[PDB]
Amino acid sequence: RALRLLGEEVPRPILPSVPSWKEAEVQTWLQQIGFSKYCESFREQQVDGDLLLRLTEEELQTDLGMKSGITRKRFFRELTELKTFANYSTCDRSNLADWLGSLDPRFRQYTYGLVSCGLDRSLLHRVSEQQLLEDCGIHLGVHRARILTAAREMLHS
Amino acid sequence: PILPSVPSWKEAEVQTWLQQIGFSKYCESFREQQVDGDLLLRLTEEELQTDLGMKSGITRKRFFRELTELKTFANYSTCDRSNLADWLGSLDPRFRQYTYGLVSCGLDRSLLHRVSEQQLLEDCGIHLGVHRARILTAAREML
Amino acid sequence: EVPRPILPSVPSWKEAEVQTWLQQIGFSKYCESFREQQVDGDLLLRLTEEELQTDLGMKSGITRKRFFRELTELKTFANYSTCDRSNLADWLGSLDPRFRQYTYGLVSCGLDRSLLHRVSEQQLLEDCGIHLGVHRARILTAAREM
Amino acid sequence: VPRPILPSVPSWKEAEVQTWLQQIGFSKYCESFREQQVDGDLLLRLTEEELQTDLGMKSGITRKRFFRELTELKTFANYSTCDRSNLADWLGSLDPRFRQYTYGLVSCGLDRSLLHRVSEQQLLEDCGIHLGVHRARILTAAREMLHS
Amino acid sequence: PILPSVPSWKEAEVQTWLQQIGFSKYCESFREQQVDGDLLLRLTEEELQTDLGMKSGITRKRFFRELTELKTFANYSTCDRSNLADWLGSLDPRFRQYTYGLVSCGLDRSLLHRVSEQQLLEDCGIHLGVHRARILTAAREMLHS
Amino acid sequence: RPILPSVPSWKEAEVQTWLQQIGFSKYCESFREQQVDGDLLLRLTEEELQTDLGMKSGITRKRFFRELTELKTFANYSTCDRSNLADWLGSLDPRFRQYTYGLVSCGLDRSLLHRVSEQQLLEDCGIHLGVHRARILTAAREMLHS
Amino acid sequence: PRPILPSVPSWKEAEVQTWLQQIGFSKYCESFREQQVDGDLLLRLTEEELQTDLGMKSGITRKRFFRELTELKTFANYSTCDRSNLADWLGSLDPRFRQYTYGLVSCGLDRSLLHRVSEQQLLEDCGIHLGVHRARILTAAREM
Amino acid sequence: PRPILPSVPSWKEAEVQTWLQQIGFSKYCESFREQQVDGDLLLRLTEEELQTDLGMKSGITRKRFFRELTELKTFANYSTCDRSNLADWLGSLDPRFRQYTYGLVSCGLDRSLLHRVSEQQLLEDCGIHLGVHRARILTAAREMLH
């Protein structure tokens, strides 16, 4: 029953609908995770839920002014947590979230990446390593390999 | 309603659209650079950054988000004799956005079968590998 | 609203006719550069991105795109009879009207109908200036039959 | 439960990192580590690049001294919170010094059952095992592991 | 008319030619650099831009247009024992321009059969692939003694 | 002329003394500032010597490495060398003893040596001469185990 | 007139100086003097050395220079350094190949060793830059 | 007493200085002195060291220098460092190969080991830059009596 989601540490709300978040909800989340210093940049750049989920190292450094690699790592650590527990129902008709989660709960974080390229359960069998890296933004080879393996052993008949 | 005929748009219609999507700040650049429908549909990251002065990667992403919407719900009938728009749309509504890319290289339904992955990327401007692969696959099996 | 004359003998154009065409397509701003650089028909037909940017001072990629849009139109409807003995223009046009634009590129390398069968992909790209892969592939395919 | 023998570095907060820096004679860097908000997780995952550029440790020699201390800490740390399959003891059985790679492997979501499928590239790029000799030994031993 | 013996041209004849083709502007550079017939025939894009100060790619294209004409209608007899000029010309009049490139490497009719594509490009300065291919083809269908 | 000096356990002060003995007192300050002890001395690279210790001349670096090689040849490695690789390397060629710390720092011992590759001896262990690498590798494949 | 069998390998600075005058390169006498160019160095001169060390900035001027040097190399006496008379061997193939003598003998090649030479060796070690020349020299070397 | 072949491996700074004077490189005496070049370092000198550390900016000057050094290397006495007499072995192949002696013995090669040497080793470890030379030395090494 390892549910730290009922803990005080974890940002509120739990199970948030990040894809539909607007600037204001992004602002709230930055405060909770101790990144208030970056509120102004995120506001100016008009980061909403969709952009937050799609944020890259490059955008974070150049457009949002987060110069430290260590600070970016802290940021992505928080964003990965958010992505892991987010509600993707609006954008995830085939429930790729659960498919990824069944492989490993920490793979749920890739949901928006996969649905953003127009992948779904039916198409997943045909996905390539290149696609998972370039299109879906899965940077860890270990993760790519596991997802790829499981995708090839899917029943599409 | 009726879908706008973006391929035939002039500078003035492009200006109107920029206002509607909250990109008024860029009206002057678009005017100076004489962006019409054809050029708007064919706009690249590079042109947006260097020639139109949109320095932020995030702002460009917001812009392309709006442009993709426009491309998705545009009327291509003047330039799309074989109705590639509907073919793409039937595969996935999101693929309609690639209509102008394909017709600009002189592709139509009949020629589509012969297209390569490189061609869809370099010539047609389809950047997502997933999209390329699906379009390629479907093209070979209509043959 | 199409620039006059239609169906022009662009290969034989001098500086003056290039000047007139620039006016018609709304590029009067560039008349001075074209004049200074002494662009005639032959040079206009062979103009590259690089020459347009560096030597003619067209700094914007979007402006260059507008320019090439107009140049492509001119090339598509031009009369190549003086330089195209084997009528490659009609051969290209029969494949797709849009391919007629490549006429000068092919005849400038000394290609004709009879030699076309032997041409390579590299040759069409580097020597003939056919930049679109789709176009190269179609032209290559049709050339291998004849 | 006051003082543990093997420190729970994965669960360390900024303050414990600060204390450790003092003990190892790197007080000079306390401010940078504080400003950059280095906790246990970030300490364990620190790279050459971060140390030089973000923490301002310009000398390669100074960085070597730092990593000498970090490697010791990593070798004797308690990973129980984050290491369900006890990869620490698996690595340790091969060579005590290899226990230092625990956090690198568990951070990618590797465990004993997944070890058989791991590639040399993955050990280098994803897990941060830079010494070829170490990679080769770990790879060899992993080939005799049972998968699912 | 008379075909000029460009291989044997001196600076003065090069100067005259520049005037005739409307490149008087460049007379001084060509004089300073001591361009004779041999150097004129062997002139590269690089030399034209850097050493002779012809900055514009368009201007360089105009120049090479004139040089190609000259090369097409030059007399190569002093340096072309085996008459490669006529062999090239028979293939296509426009190929005569490559005479000096071939004879400068010590090629002749008898050696031509053995030549490689790399050699035609690097050693002989034939830049157009189409031209190279045609010359190569015709060389292989010669007399092989 | 030190007899079996225990360089792996040397502190800053012993490194300082050594620098004096070999006529490199000029570099005492940098070595002090950088806190070079025995372990760091044995693992010193060309890069660290140039950039961190301010030894700009390649010729001076060569002189320095000539002295370091001597020290490494005669050092006592007993604290870090449980399988006595030092004697094994020395028996092959006295000049190979200098590679002891490179090998034991990667956790190698007599029993493991056979599995090492030429790339590993270069990249991991710092054996720069190919001739040396090849000889060590060959002898390692033919050695007696338990 | 045109010098008969000059012993360029044995030339000293003074002879190099004289030759520069004769070919109309007096402007460069100072550089060649300062750099102490003798016969051996003249025969081994590279594009790089000519540009950077001798100050001959123009590619066209360098081309003129090498045109003269090639002539000199073609007519030189190599007897001091060419025991097996590779000069005459090369010359018999084509008079223009004589220019490569010093390149070959400087690597310690002779008639007897020539058969074993590789294309790479002729290019990198001997400084024969023209492929056409390399190929012909290689061919003839295999058949003697 | 004066030896015929100089014992360059054993030369000290003072002998190097003398040699520089004799060959007309007095201009460089100061640099060589400051850098403490002895026989060992002189024999091992590289293009890079000569340019950067000794201040010999001209490639032509460096060529003159190496011309002199090659002669010295060819006729040097290597007996202190060449127990198996590789000098005579190389010399028997071609007198000019004797110049590579110090390169070979510095990697710890001798007659008995020579059979095992690779092309890469002769280039990278021994500093034999001429392909022609490498090939001849390699060939002769393979066909030796082990």
Numbering used by the authors:
A (entry chain B): 392 to 548
B (entry chain A): 404 to 546
C (entry chain H): 400 to 545
D (entry chain C): 401 to 548
E (entry chain G): 404 to 548
F (entry chain D): 403 to 548
G (entry chain F): 402 to 545
H (entry chain E): 402 to 547
From the paper:
In this way, SARM1 activation is triggered by a decrease in the concentration of a cellular metabolite NAD+, rather than depending on the introduction of an activating factor.
We first collected cryo-EM images of the purified hSARM1E642Q. 2D classification and 3D reconstruction revealed an octamer ring assembly with clearly visible inner ring, which is attributed to the tandem SAM domains. Exploring different buffers, pH and salt conditions, addition of various detergents, as well as variations in cryo-EM grid preparation (e.g. ice thickness) did not affect the visibility of the octamer peripheral ring considerably. As it became clear that the compact two-ring structure is inhibited for NADase activity, we considered whether the purified hSARM1, that was not subjected to GraFix and predominantly presents just the inner SAM ring in cryo-EM 2D averaging and 3D reconstruction, is active in vitro. Using a resazurin fluorescence assay modified for an in vitro application, we measured the rate of NAD+ consumption by hSARM1w.t. in a series of NAD+ concentrations and determined a Km of 28 ± 4 µM, with Vmax of 9 ± 0.3 µM/min and Kcat of 46.49 1/min. We therefore measured the effect of NMN supplement on the NADase activity of purified hSARM1 and found a moderate 30% increase in activity with 1 mM NMN, but none at a lower concentration of 200 µM. This demonstrates that the purified hSARM1 is mostly NADase active, even without NMN supplement, supporting the idea of a predominantly open conformation as seen in cryo-EM.
